[PDB]
Amino acid sequence: MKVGIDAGGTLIKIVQEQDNQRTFKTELTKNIDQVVEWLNQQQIEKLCLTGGNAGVIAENINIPAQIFVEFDAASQGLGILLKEQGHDLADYIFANVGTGTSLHYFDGQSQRRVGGIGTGGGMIQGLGYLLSQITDYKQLTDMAQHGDRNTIDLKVRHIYKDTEPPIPGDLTAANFGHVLHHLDADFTPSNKLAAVIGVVGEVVTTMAITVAREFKTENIVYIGSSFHNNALLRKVVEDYTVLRGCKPYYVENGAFSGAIGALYLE
């Protein structure tokens, strides 16, 4: 068997290949000791590593392992998954929405990193904690789907009132920009959490359409685990990608692009 590991800041993504059967395992980066141990109990024909914690694994296992640069590995894996699922895209932006967010332009034969921003899943978790005292990711994300942003976010029509805006009125003018018009309010943990995800999705999508235009593609492929159990984030990103005339794509097992890629760079 063959194993691929993308050991990120938050999640360790593991892909095992026997015959042609794939196994897709996720594990916490916090529990990296139990990944190293599992690995040490296994019969492995080939081990390929990538991600920020790849080296922690590599220095505590009993076998050699090839190590790849995660930008390369993610592009390779995502090419594999896009093909298999029927997407045949000449070019595209891809946005790896992980703990942080990295943005890449794939021109048809290779990738180039073209931007990055620190708004991603880490912010959802961290800023989510500070506003809700919720540490559990499922709990945090589920609760945010129950939320309404309208008392928190300020729209363009709120600013332009009864006059004609220079950009459409329903757009977000200012994330958290309505909070001070609603100080009579509670600000419920759900509402606050939807606004966090709101701001994270809008920033990511904004940067992505921006570089899409810069590199003259209209296809944007979103990946990373930040979308798992977060319909809200996936909605926010999708709607605004379409609103600005780009085509968004999500891919089955998108979050393992890295782990897959590492296997097929060997």
Ligand X SMILES: Nc1ncnc2c1ncn2[C@@H]1O[C@H](COP(=O)(O)OP(=O)(O)OP(=O)(O)O)[C@@H](O)[C@H]1O
Ligand Y SMILES: CC(C)(C)[C@@H](O)C(=O)NCCC(=O)NCc1ccc2c(c1)OCO2
Binding-site members are 6-13, 99, 121-125, 137, 225
Has 70 been annotated as catalytic? yes
Which positions from 87 through 106 interact with a second copy, judged by CB under 8 A? 99-100
CA distances from 236 to 51, 80, 108, 132, 156 (A): 27, 26, 27, 21, 17
Distance CA 212, CA 249 (A): 13
Binding residues for ATP: 6-13, 99, 121-125, 137, 225
**Percent of residues in the chain assigned helix, strand, coil, to nearest 5:** 45, 25, 35
Question: Which span sits near ligand Y by CB under 6 A: 57-65, 99-107, 186-194, 256-264?
Answer: 99-107
Closest contact distance (angstroms) between CB of 114 and ligand Y is 10
Count the neighbouring beta carbons within 10 Å of the beta carbon of residue 31.
12
Q: Exactly one of 70, 218, 238, 252 is catalytic; which is it?
A: 70
159 binding a second copy? (CB under 8 A)? yes
266's CB contacts (< 8 A; 6+ apart) are: 46, 48, 66
Closest contact distance (angstroms) between CB of 102 and a second copy is 8
Closest contact distance (angstroms) between CB of 192 and a second copy is 6
Distance CA 257, CA 79 (A): 8
Closest contact distance (angstroms) between CB of 71 and ligand Y is 7
Q: Residue 202: name the closest of 98, 130, 102, 120 by CA.
A: 120
The catalytic site residues sit at 70
Q: Which residues form the interface with a second copy (CB under 8 A)?
A: 8-9, 52-56, 69-71, 99-100, 113, 115-123, 125-127, 129-131, 135, 152-154, 156, 158-163, 165-167, 171-180, 183, 187, 192, 199, 202-203, 206-207, 210-211, 213-214
